[PDB]
Amino acid sequence: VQVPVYSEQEYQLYLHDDAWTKAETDHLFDLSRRFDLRFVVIHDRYDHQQFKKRSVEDLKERYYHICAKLANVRA
Ligand SMILES: [Ca+2]
Numbered sequence: 001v002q003v004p005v006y007s008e009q010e011y012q013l014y015l016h017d018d019a020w021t022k023a024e025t026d027h028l029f030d031l032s033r034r035f036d037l038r039f040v041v042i043h044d045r046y047d048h049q050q051f052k053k054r055s056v057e058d059l060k061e062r063y064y065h066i067c068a069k070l071a072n073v074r075a
Contacts, residue, residue, distance in 0.1 A: 003033045004070050014069050020062060024051045028059060029066075 006015060006029075011022055027050075031042040043056045054062075 003029060003037065004067060005029075006066065006070060010070065010073065014073050015066055017062070021051075025062065025066070027051065028062060032063060 011025070015025065016022075017025075027047055028042070031045055035041040035045065039056050039060055043054070043059060046054065046059075
């Protein structure tokens with residue numbers, strides 16, 4: 001499986017979360033592409049200058065909830 005790519009419109013309409021910025025979400029997806037979805041590595045390399053402490057499970061939940069939402073809105 002590949003990392004999904006969402007458009008700006010898809011993010012605005014369907015992917016916002018009160019506790020996540022689009023910048024952080026884009027960072028998570030960029031690291032997921034660069035580090036082959038190895039969440040221990042993504043977690044270790046996360047930008048903690050800009051973004052708060054997230055657990056590995058928090059990163060996975062964000063990534064996988066976006067995957068499920070995109071699957072539904074693209075159907
Ligand atoms: Ca990759």
